[PDB]
Amino acid sequence: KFGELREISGNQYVNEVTNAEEDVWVIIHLYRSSIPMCLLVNQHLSLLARKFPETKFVKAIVNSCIQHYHDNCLPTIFVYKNGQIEAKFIGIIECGGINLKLEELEWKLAEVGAIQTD
Amino acid sequence: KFGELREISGNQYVNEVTNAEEDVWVIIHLYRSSIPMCLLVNQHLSLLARKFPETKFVKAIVNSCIQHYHDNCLPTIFVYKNGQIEAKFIGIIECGGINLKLEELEWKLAEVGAIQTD
Ligand code: NA
Ligand code: NA
């Protein structure tokens, strides 16, 4: 259905995330390449997108979404379904610390319902 | 408190509208200069801004808020309080027709609580 992690701009946010296909989970990562954790989080998300082609995976440089966003709120991951926020992970502690492995983020997104298999 | 109609970009939407000062009414006009009605609506909204300095009045070119936005949804006026949408006016018919005078926008914005003399 999907399968790959996608880069989007600020003005594509509403279309891709808030108005995403009905009943689809969207996982948007709000990021800055300047932050090592963001670089890492995207690594796992690229991989997780392929493993869960049913879930939508997008990412965006916060500067083109929300101006003057603070480093201490990064990384930011929001989980959406039907234009509603199902989960928020804001900052290092919530996104699961500076060391964060593939399977830990997988789990993180799982207990909240964002990704499933069959 | 405010007093003038102000131009914002897409990435200033979240800060200026969704996260606007608690209890403040925000009137955002999503527009394009190519559409006469929009030109006319900004005229009224500039004047109204000054008359109701308690209400926040902003305007923004949709192309930098939502990409691929359809002419037929213009003009778009959203009314916000505390990050929640109180009223939506989308397209010519709802923004009160091609002839639309200062006082009938005022009334329309007033009927739903956006502007006030106290
Ligand atoms: Na489900
Ligand atoms: Na009130």
We report the CATH number of the domain holding residue B115 as: 3.40.30.10
Give the distance from residue B16's alpha carbon to the nearest chain A alpha carbon, in angstroms. Answer: 10
How many domains does one find in chain A?
1
According to the entry, how was the structure determined?
A: X-ray
As to burial, measured by CB atoms within 10 angstroms (0-12 exposed, 13-18 middle, 19+ buried), residue B27 is: buried
Q: What DSSP designation does B41 have?
A: H
Count of C-beta atoms within a 10 Å radius of residue A44: 21
Chain B CB contacts of A9 under 8 Å are 67
Task: For residues A88 and A105, give the distance between their C-alpha atoms in angstroms, rounded to a whole number.
Answer: 13
Please say whether the beta carbons of B48 and B40 come within 8 A. Answer: no
Name the residue among A15, A65, A67 with its Cβ closest to that of B67. A15
Task: For residues B13 and B31, give the distance between their C-alpha atoms in angstroms, rounded to a whole number.
Answer: 14
Task: For residues A50 and A45, give the distance between their C-alpha atoms in angstroms, rounded to a whole number.
Answer: 9
Beta bridge partners of B81: B25, B84
Find the closest chain A residue to B65 by CA distance. Answer: A11
Chain A CB contacts of B11 under 8 Å are 10, 63-67
* CB < 8 Å & 24+ apart, contacts of B45-50: B45/B5, B45/B105, B46/B4, B46/B5, B47/B102, B48/B102, B48/B105, B48/B106, B48/B109, B48/B115, B49/B2, B49/B3, B49/B4, B49/B5, B50/B3, B50/B4
Tell me the resolution in Å: 2.7
Domain span at residue B51 reads 1-118
The answer for residues whose C-beta is within 8 angstroms of residue A88's C-beta and 6 or more apart is A76, A77, A78, A79, A94
Q: How many helices (H) and strands (E) does chain A have?
A: 3, 5
List C-alpha distances in Å: A5 to A53, A56, B68: 10, 8, 22
Q: How many helices (H) and strands (E) does chain B have?
A: 3, 5
Angle, helix B102-110 to helix B36-51, in steps of 10 degrees: 70
Rg (CA), chain A: 13
Name the residue among B11, B65, B68 with its Cβ closest to that of A67. B11
